[PDB]
Design a protein around this motif. Structure first.
Motif, mmCIF file in Angstrom:
data_model
loop_
_atom_site.group_PDB
_atom_site.id
_atom_site.type_symbol
_atom_site.label_atom_id
_atom_site.label_comp_id
_atom_site.label_asym_id
_atom_site.label_seq_id
_atom_site.Cartn_x
_atom_site.Cartn_y
_atom_site.Cartn_z
ATOM 1 N N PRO A 173 -1.869 3.970 -7.034
ATOM 2 C CA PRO A 173 -1.478 4.350 -5.673
ATOM 3 C C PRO A 173 -1.145 5.836 -5.560
ATOM 4 C CG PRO A 173 0.248 3.051 -6.728
ATOM 5 C CD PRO A 173 -0.975 2.943 -7.594
ATOM 6 N N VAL A 174 -1.447 6.419 -4.401
ATOM 7 C CA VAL A 174 -1.255 7.850 -4.177
ATOM 8 C C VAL A 174 0.212 8.249 -4.340
ATOM 9 C CG1 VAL A 174 -1.004 7.578 -1.668
ATOM 10 C CG2 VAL A 174 -1.708 9.789 -2.611
ATOM 11 N N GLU B 81 -7.877 8.228 0.183
ATOM 12 C CA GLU B 81 -7.443 6.863 -0.051
ATOM 13 C C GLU B 81 -8.621 5.902 0.078
ATOM 14 O OE1 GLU B 81 -3.577 5.668 1.826
ATOM 15 O OE2 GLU B 81 -4.638 3.783 2.167
ATOM 16 N N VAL C 21 -7.223 6.052 -5.363
ATOM 17 C CA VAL C 21 -7.178 7.349 -4.709
ATOM 18 C C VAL C 21 -8.153 8.326 -5.350
ATOM 19 C CG1 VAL C 21 -5.706 9.249 -3.964
ATOM 20 C CG2 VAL C 21 -4.754 6.946 -4.189
#
Length: 142
Positions: free
Chosen positions: A12-13, A94, A99
């Protein structure tokens, strides 16, 4: 001449953002190859803040300091900075798989474009794996 190097991280970013901004983690991926390694990393995250990461090679001869100023900082989205006389923007795209770290930077034409591109690409490969290996997996707990 603008080179765009990118790679998708399965993390996840929220984590990718911090892994790219935290000096302690930066010095773990700030290397084009294992032949290089980070000795020190000073990163001030803010609009008007500067970063200086020391990438040196274990061969004993090769080594340099990578310093730049953050002109524009968009949290968890895009990092637009100027390093020396050059400028580069790191955009976090995204995707459903993760990402995609897209780095578009200004490059010289009197220098081997492929060498510059593959250099940053190699760094991205190291960065990518560092974030994906930074993903801990226990029976929850933490």
């Amino acid at each position: 001449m603008n080179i765009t190097v990118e790679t998708t991280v399965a993390a996840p970013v929220g984590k990718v953002w911090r892994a790219y901004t935290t000096p302690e983690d930066i010095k773990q991926w700030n290397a084009a190859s294992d032949d290089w390694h980070t000795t020190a990393a000073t990163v001030d995250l803010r609009e008007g803040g500067a970063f200086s990461s020391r990438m040196e090679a274990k061969d004993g001869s090769m080594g340099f300091d990578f310093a730049g100023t953050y002109t524009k900082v968009v949290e968890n989205k895009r990092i637009e900075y100027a390093f020396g006389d050059r400028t580069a923007k790191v955009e976090f795209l995204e995707a459903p798989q993760g990402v995609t770290v897209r780095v578009s930077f200004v490059a010289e034409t009197e220098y081997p474009v492929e060498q510059q591109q593959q250099g940053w690409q190699a760094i991205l490969n190291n960065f990518k794996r560092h974030v994906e290996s930074h993903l801990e997996h226990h029976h929850h707990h933490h």
